[PDB]
């Protein structure tokens, strides 16, 4: 098969500036008829791929003029001028010269912005859950930048490390921030044997509650 290589896993860009994404093929994609059979797609998280450029330089329908494409027979470039927050996602090249069609590994576009501390909110178990014999305490660390962040839990003053599961969102398409959710799960009996629960975010911001304080 024709091998498609995208050597950069990701590329950073400041909003308002231009960025170039590269791709190369193992064989020339220029056909005897004068056309070069290279395509570019964008895929946003949780969405199907969307066509951006066809036959190396033609702009697909519904795509803004900020996108353009160029290249030789084996080296191609997707250019995005005046980058917007909504442009976040993974960009893929594909060859349509011969079967089987093949895709490059994709390059993730990462937007830069000013540092932002997280907005933190903690949530005691719902009483409906306690009936199941389990108890999950949830803490949201929302809209922060950069992406790396740490979370620490404490029960009755002591750090607790076991029973914690974390999940992170992809970069926000409106404000270019990141978010994270951390969940500490204990048995109902253990939850009831303690009273102070604390969520600490170090990017330290602390949020806490006492179980019987209602």
């Amino acid at each position: 098969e024709i091998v498609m290589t995208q050597a950069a896993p990701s590329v950073p860009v400041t909003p308002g500036e231009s960025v170039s994404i590269s791709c190369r093929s193992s064989k020339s994609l220029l056909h005897s008829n004068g056309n070069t059979y290279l395509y570019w797609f964008l895929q946003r998280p949780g969405q199907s791929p969307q066509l951006l450029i066809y036959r190396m330089s033609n702009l697909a329908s519904g795509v803004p003029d900020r996108f353009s494409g160029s290249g030789s027979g084996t080296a191609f470039t997707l250019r995005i001028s005046r980058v917007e927050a909504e442009d976040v996602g993974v960009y893929y090249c594909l060859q349509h010269l011969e079967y089987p069609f093949t895709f490059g590994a994709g390059t993730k576009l990462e937007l830069k912005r000013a540092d932002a501390a997280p907005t933190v909110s903690i949530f005691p178990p719902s009483s409906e859950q306690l009936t199941s014999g389990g108890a999950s305490v949830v803490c949201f660390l929302n809209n922060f930048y950069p992406k790396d962040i740490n979370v620490k839990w404490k029960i009755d003053g002591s750090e607790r490390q076991n029973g914690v599961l974390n999940s992170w969102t992809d970069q926000d398409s409106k404000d270019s921030t990141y978010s994270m959710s951390s969940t500490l799960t204990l048995t109902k009996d253990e939850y009831e044997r303690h009273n102070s629960y604390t969520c600490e975010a170090t990017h330290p911001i602390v949020k806490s509650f006492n179980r019987n304080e209602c």
């Binding site: 199907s48 791929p49 895709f103 974390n166």
Partner: protein
């Protein structure tokens, strides 16, 4: 809209599954239907294509025998049968087709997430999360379901700007997902806010209204 695919299929290892892709409109017999694989968090891989009017097929050698493409022109539906399934076959499978006249338009189905496992389907338990007893943040915990995915909304789609729905996490062979929504302090509890969760795999839909916590 243009290509309709089911959200999920739960299949046992070693068994087979037939995936459907129903196309709208009149030109089903004149456009190639393509199939693409995408493992969770990974890249895209082209499986093969079929021309509905003639049944002619082009298969990527890597999928020979694993995938069989067919069509029913009488109901404008394309099918992909995947055989002798293994864990490496768990992935999202898309169908796609070019526009009859224009080369600059490609339509894609939403993708079907195939999960290969011996486990049974389990519906989620959905819990409303009100604040501890400016703005206010509320949450919704969707716990202990199998397989993925679930579709969660707030006020049936009327609240969306301040929402963060997180990737699900697998633990003890069941999935759990959480979502937060942040609004102005005068918005709630003054006005009703409800978490809506659908889990098609178990044919379930539940709505949970968020209520201020009480002395209970």
């Amino acid at each position: 809209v243009q290509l309709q695919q089911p959200g999920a299929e739960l299949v046992k290892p070693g068994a087979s599954v037939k995936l459907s892709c129903k196309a709208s409109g009149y030109t089903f017999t004149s456009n190639w239907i393509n199939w693409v694989k995408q493992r969770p968090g990974q890249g895209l891989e082209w499986i093969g294509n079929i021309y509905p009017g003639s049944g002619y097929t082009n298969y990527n050698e890597r999928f020979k025998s694993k995938a069989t493409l067919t069509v029913d022109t009488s109901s404008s539906t394309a099918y992909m049968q995947l055989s002798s399934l293994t864990s490496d076959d768990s992935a999202v499978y898309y169908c796609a087709r070019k526009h009859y006249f224009y080369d600059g338009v490609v339509y894609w189905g939403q993708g079907t997430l195939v999960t290969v496992s011996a486990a049974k389907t389990t519906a989620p338990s959905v819990y409303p999360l009100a604040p501890v007893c400016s703005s206010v943040t509320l949450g919704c915990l969707v716990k202990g379901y199998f397989p993925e995915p679930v579709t969660l909304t707030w006020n049936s789609g009327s609240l969306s700007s301040g929402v963060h729905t997180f990737p699900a996490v697998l633990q003890s062979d069941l999935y759990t997902l959480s979502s937060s929504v942040t609004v102005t302090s005068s918005t709630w509890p003054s006005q009703s806010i409800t978490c809506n969760v659908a889990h098609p795999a178990s044919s379930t839909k539940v709505d949970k209204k968020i209520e201020p916590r009480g002395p209970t």
